[PDB]
Amino acid sequence: RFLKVKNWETDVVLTDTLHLKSTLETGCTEHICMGSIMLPTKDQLFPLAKEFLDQYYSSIKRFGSKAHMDRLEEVNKEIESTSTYQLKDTELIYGAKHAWRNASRCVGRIQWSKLQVFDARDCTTAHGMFNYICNHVKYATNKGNLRSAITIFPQRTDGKHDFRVWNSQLIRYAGYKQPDGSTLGDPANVQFTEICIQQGWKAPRGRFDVLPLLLQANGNDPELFQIPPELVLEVPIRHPKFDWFKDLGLKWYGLPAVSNMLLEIGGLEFSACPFSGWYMGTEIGVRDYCDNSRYNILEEVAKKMDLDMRKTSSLWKDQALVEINIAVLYSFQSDKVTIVDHHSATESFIKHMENEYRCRGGCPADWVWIVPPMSGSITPVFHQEMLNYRLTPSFEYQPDPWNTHVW
Amino acid sequence: RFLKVKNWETDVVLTDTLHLKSTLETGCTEHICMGSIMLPVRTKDQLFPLAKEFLDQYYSSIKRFGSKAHMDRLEEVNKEIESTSTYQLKDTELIYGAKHAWRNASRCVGRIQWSKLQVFDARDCTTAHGMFNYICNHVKYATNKGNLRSAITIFPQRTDGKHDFRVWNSQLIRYAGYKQPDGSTLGDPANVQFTEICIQQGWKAPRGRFDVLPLLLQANGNDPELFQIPPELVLEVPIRHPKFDWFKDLGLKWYGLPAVSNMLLEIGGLEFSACPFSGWYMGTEIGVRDYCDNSRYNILEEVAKKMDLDMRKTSSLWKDQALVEINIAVLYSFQSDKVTIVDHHSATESFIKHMENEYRCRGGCPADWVWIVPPMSGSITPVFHQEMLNYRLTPSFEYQPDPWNTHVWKG
Numbered sequence A: 001r002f003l004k005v006k007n008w009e010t011d012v013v014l015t016d017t018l019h020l021k022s023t024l025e026t027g028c029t030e031h032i033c034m035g036s037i038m039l040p041t042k043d044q045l046f047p048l049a050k051e052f053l054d055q056y057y058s059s060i061k062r063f064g065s066k067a068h069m070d071r072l073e074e075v076n077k078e079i080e081s082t083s084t085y086q087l088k089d090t091e092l093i094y095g096a097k098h099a100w101r102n103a104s105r106c107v108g109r110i111q112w113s114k115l116q117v118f119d120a121r122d123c124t125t126a127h128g129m130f131n132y133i134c135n136h137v138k139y140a141t142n143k144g145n146l147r148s149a150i151t152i153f154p155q156r157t158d159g160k161h162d163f164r165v166w167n168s169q170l171i172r173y174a175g176y177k178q179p180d181g182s183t184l185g186d187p188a189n190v191q192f193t194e195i196c197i198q199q200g201w202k203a204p205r206g207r208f209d210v211l212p213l214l215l216q217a218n219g220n221d222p223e224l225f226q227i228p229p230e231l232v233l234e235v236p237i238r239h240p241k242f243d244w245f246k247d248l249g250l251k252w253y254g255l256p257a258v259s260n261m262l263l264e265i266g267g268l269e270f271s272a273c274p275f276s277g278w279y280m281g282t283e284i285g286v287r288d289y290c291d292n293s294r295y296n297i298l299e300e301v302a303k304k305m306d307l308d309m310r311k312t313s314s315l316w317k318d319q320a321l322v323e324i325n326i327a328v329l330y331s332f333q334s335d336k337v338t339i340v341d342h343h344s345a346t347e348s349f350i351k352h353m354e355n356e357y358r359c360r361g362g363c364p365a366d367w368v369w370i371v372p373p374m375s376g377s378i379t380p381v382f383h384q385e386m387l388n389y390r391l392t393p394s395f396e397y398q399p400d401p402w403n404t405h406v407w
Numbered sequence B: 001r002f003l004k005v006k007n008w009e010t011d012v013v014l015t016d017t018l019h020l021k022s023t024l025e026t027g028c029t030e031h032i033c034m035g036s037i038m039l040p041v042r043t044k045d046q047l048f049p050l051a052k053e054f055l056d057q058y059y060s061s062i063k064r065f066g067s068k069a070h071m072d073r074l075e076e077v078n079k080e081i082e083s084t085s086t087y088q089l090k091d092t093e094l095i096y097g098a099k100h101a102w103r104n105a106s107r108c109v110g111r112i113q114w115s116k117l118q119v120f121d122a123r124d125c126t127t128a129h130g131m132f133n134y135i136c137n138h139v140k141y142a143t144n145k146g147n148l149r150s151a152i153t154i155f156p157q158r159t160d161g162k163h164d165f166r167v168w169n170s171q172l173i174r175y176a177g178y179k180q181p182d183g184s185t186l187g188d189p190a191n192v193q194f195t196e197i198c199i200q201q202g203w204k205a206p207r208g209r210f211d212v213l214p215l216l217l218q219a220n221g222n223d224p225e226l227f228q229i230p231p232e233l234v235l236e237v238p239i240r241h242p243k244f245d246w247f248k249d250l251g252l253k254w255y256g257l258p259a260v261s262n263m264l265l266e267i268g269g270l271e272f273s274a275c276p277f278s279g280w281y282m283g284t285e286i287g288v289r290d291y292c293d294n295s296r297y298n299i300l301e302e303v304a305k306k307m308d309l310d311m312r313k314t315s316s317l318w319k320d321q322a323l324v325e326i327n328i329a330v331l332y333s334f335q336s337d338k339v340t341i342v343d344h345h346s347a348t349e350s351f352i353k354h355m356e357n358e359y360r361c362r363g364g365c366p367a368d369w370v371w372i373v374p375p376m377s378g379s380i381t382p383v384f385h386q387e388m389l390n391y392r393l394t395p396s397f398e399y400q401p402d403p404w405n406t407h408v409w410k411g
């Protein structure tokens, strides 16, 4: 009931009690673990609100105070009346920061309280959303000195007036099905690169074409918008030794800005809430270049290294994967763009873990996602036991808009 | 209830029905996941249903469920239990059990080989010296001059828990580790505590960086005794690198036979507390864990020095780079000497095939993602994007407290 977790590299033991607060469910049972599965009314709303407000006023050392009680009373009232309710800005911010704080899959959470919240709740149109998004992108980029941000569009009402960013990230590279058979650009984004044209995009049919924003406001049809290029900071990728690297014709964008998630605070459902921070190197280089179902350029890279690509036992894929990731980090640090290496980020996380166990009594963590996709066992998190559980406020997955939209 | 797993690299979807045959607990609940927790005297009361369960599986597998052979066997076992408070497995049953225990080992990426396991029945053993004999023949048989064969040796089951057979070594073959007065460690840091016990038990330690440890064996609950595996029986491979000639000079070598000996085999309620088993190495086990883990030989840095890497900023990925070269060297040294070894890409590929085959033919395949995924280059092996249900089946291999923590010293 008061669980412990052992780091095996260091024998350190943390005790977890925060999990007892856990409110939502995992997908696991006593009989089956699903830790490696990707995605396992006025009456429900009020308990949701109270729980949130209780933790909020507790966090400001005014638990049980007049303001607290009155606020709980005030919200309770508006709920009975309007069937929903609205969050004070302070609550909105506390909420946002805490959904990140509780994002069990996120290795970067040590930064969780330095989040810039943009209240875009007054928005009414796709054009408006576009204006708010450009503003976010510009702010977060900060000439390469990246800052974390989130922009929150009006909460769901009755599932009809839904605000949604159809892009999965604000900034992503187009991907096209070749008549040749293969795939040009980014394969992840193929179906999306279609929907854009299916909705009227004029694709430059290149490789690194920045996808257009497809914003949907108040449940209406979604509209296309193009991000001003001067707002899209990119880094041409080059190796600090292999000068044939730049020849490979590679660059990547500096701003990772996830847009398809649902943010939940005190029962309210912000279905558009694009947020961003900065890349861990391996997100672009292990994942965005070298996944089979992505840029898949490993073969060509090692080809250019004249490595024995005949048998797997030469570990050519590994050697190459390492150089590519060295290049990514090298180019970003060169162009004065924020990035963190996977050793540094995992180190920061262990500290953040220790910090949360100390000041908060625990920290939910999803080992399968926290461990970098390369060099796993030489990062400190590998040997770190982690408890996974779901807390509120949270970020949740949500169905792709094109599977839901009533046109 | 059906459950689906999806491979996100290939969109292949599989459907698990097997998880319904799962009894044992996971550690998990609906409000917490212990999926990354390393570790999450039995009466006639709870024995017979465990036995029936086993025998039922056993007779289904031989397509004789409900046969008179099956029913008499149940009866035979029943009566042997209520009379003797335990029972004995037939040879057929012991073999099936050991194989299935491996097959159910949800953390083992090597399971494709599960049906080809040589089972040595050492249930007639009575002394440590007898144990040394059995173990010696295991090692010789499994080693097969570098052409490794999977094998397990099974010592008598636990009776009253006061007469346990145990192998105190964690693996049959392992290098000593010595903590020095200055704080440094000579040999394998992973083995220091055991090395100490060994020394206290009268072992005369060479105190070299690569001393094969003695077997510390326990029979019928007696105090353990020391035995030196004859060196001609211990196959080793010196570690060199194919392009780096300075590598051999790091003075490295590893033993060829991985043979885990501290686990506990459970079959039909019976507990086999001494059941050393062996297969062959995946390269990363030696290369990534056995040299490069910060709590191991940690030649990561020296390899890095010799490569003249940029060890200043970690964002040079010098650690990553050295790690790769060390694993190249491990695989290369082994293949050159015709000692069986598998690389992580090969092993994971194999596993996916095995797993898919198991879903189709068995209705699932319990698998621990945290352990199946290799400790380097995770996402460029096919298991990384493979969803996996994890659950416990019997027969199984279980952890068990170190015997030095529980053992009652005769003297």
Ligand code: HEM
Residues within 6 Å of the ligand: A096, A099, A100, A103, A105, A106, A107, A108, A109, A111, A115, A148, A149, A150, A275, A276, A277, A278, A279, A280, A283, A340, A345, A369, A395
């Ligand atoms: C500032 C530096 C940050 C770093 C280095 C970082 C790092 C990461 C990494 C490496 C992942 C794994 C994702 C993958 O492999 O595809 C991840 C996931 C995640 N991040 Fe963070 N992040 C940062 C900022 C943020 C911010 C500002 C938020 C939101 C406020 C956030 C929320 C999340 C969430 C919810 C996930 C899980 C996504 C999922 O479940 O699929 N992160 N992060």
Ligand code: HEM
Residues within 6 Å of the ligand: B098, B102, B105, B107, B108, B109, B110, B111, B113, B117, B150, B151, B152, B277, B278, B279, B280, B281, B282, B285, B342, B347, B371, B397
């Ligand atoms: C024949 C080639 C084999 C290969 C390549 C192989 C590979 C592996 C690897 C790489 C691990 C993870 C080890 C670690 O990182 O600590 C593992 C775990 C395991 N293996 Fe296999 N193995 C083989 C044979 C066997 C055999 C013969 C058995 C038993 C009869 C077995 C039973 C297990 C068990 C029970 C685990 C989980 C250990 C634990 O729970 O801590 N394996 N295997």
Ligand SMILES: CN(C)Cc1ccc(OCc2ccc3ccc(N)nc3c2)cc1
Residues within 6 Å of the ligand: A108, A256, A258, A276, A277, A278, A279, A280, A283
């Ligand atoms: C499995 N993938 C192919 C699909 C997938 C796509 C985006 C995903 O979002 C992850 C995510 C979320 C927030 C982040 C914030 C900062 C950062 N550097 N990476 C971040 C990464 C997760 C999964």
Ligand SMILES: CN(C)Cc1ccc(OCc2ccc3ccc(N)nc3c2)cc1
Residues within 6 Å of the ligand: A008, B110, B258, B260, B278, B279, B280, B281, B282, B285
């Ligand atoms: C943290 N460690 C001390 C615990 C630990 C060490 C080795 C372990 O080995 C498991 C294991 C079992 C059987 C194997 C068979 C073959 C093989 N190549 N590796 C195998 C590896 C398990 C746990």
Ligand SMILES: C[C@H](O)[C@H](O)[C@H]1CNc2nc(N)[nH]c(=O)c2N1
Residues within 6 Å of the ligand: A008, A382, A383, A384, A385, A386, B036, B037, B038, B370, B371, B372, B375
């Ligand atoms: C904390 C974590 O559960 C633990 O360190 C595990 C992680 N995965 C592993 N995977 C393998 N193959 N071997 C291990 O020893 C471990 N250790």
Ligand SMILES: C[C@H](O)[C@H](O)[C@H]1CNc2nc(N)[nH]c(=O)c2N1
Residues within 6 Å of the ligand: A036, A037, A038, A368, A369, A370, A371, B008, B384, B385, B386, B387, B388
């Ligand atoms: C099968 C597994 O659940 C899936 O591939 C996960 C594994 N771990 C991951 N880890 C991170 N950081 N990001 C991911 O997308 C995934 N994918």
Ligand SMILES: [Zn+2]
Residues within 6 Å of the ligand: A028, A029, A032, A033, A034, A035, B028, B032, B033, B034, B035
């Ligand atoms: Zn679980």
